[PDB]
């Protein structure tokens, strides 16, 4: 018996392609719903850090396309956490794995229903790791998630994580930890 996950998650992958547009690079790798199956994917895919520039992995509930326009996201936000370009080597893969284990293992308490997914952006300037939420206004639910994200990933108080919505002005973040 494999151990059933509360729900079905989908791994997505996107490699940057200059000529082609965005949505067509968005490739659904597999859909799993047991711990054993998650590992089978994870053990055998390319480590996040190993990835080329402009590439992502998304892990989202099934039937949620990992984009803004999607209905599950249209009214949501995310918990952005930047990885320093130079301390990237020893942090990135921990942060991403620790998150995926946090989400599939349902660690955000009575708040799980608001988790949409998790994204890793491999980039030159900085690598990014975010947790997408369903509704960018439930600041209790968002704050609580962020506290847990900070715990799970052991992000210190000197590297602040921020929640922000999904122009006119530069839009400032809705929540920050530690606060200012």
């Amino acid at each position: 018996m494999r151990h059933p996950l509360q729900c079905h998650w989908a791994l997505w992958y996107l490699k940057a392609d200059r000529s082609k547009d965005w949505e067509d690079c968005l490739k659904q790798v597999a859909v799993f719903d047991t711990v054993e199956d998650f590992w089978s994917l994870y053990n055998h895919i390319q480590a996040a850090s190993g990835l080329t520039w402009g590439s992502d992995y998304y892990l989202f509930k099934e039937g949620i396309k990992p984009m803004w326009e999607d209905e599950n996201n249209v009214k949501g936000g995310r918990w952005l956490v930047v990885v320093d370009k130079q301390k990237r080597a020893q942090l990135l893969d921990h942060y991403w794995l620790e998150l995926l284990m946090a989400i599939i293992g349902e660690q955000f308490e009575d708040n799980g229903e608001y988790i949409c997914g998790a994204v890793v952006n491999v980039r030159q300037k900085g690598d990014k790791v975010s947790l997408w939420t369903r509704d960018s206004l439930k600041d209790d639910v968002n704050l609580r998630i962020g506290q847990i994200l900070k715990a799970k990933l052991e992000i210190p108080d000197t590297e602040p994580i921020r929640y922000e919505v999904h122009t006119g002005s530069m839009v400032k973040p809705r929540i920050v930890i530690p606060s200012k």
Binding site: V35, W39, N43, I104, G105, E106
Partner: peptide
């Protein structure tokens, strides 16, 4: 609702 911690998940590897 099914809850698995990181300790457990790693024993599944």
């Amino acid at each position: 609702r099914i809850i698995y911690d990181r300790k457990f998940l790693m024993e599944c590897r």
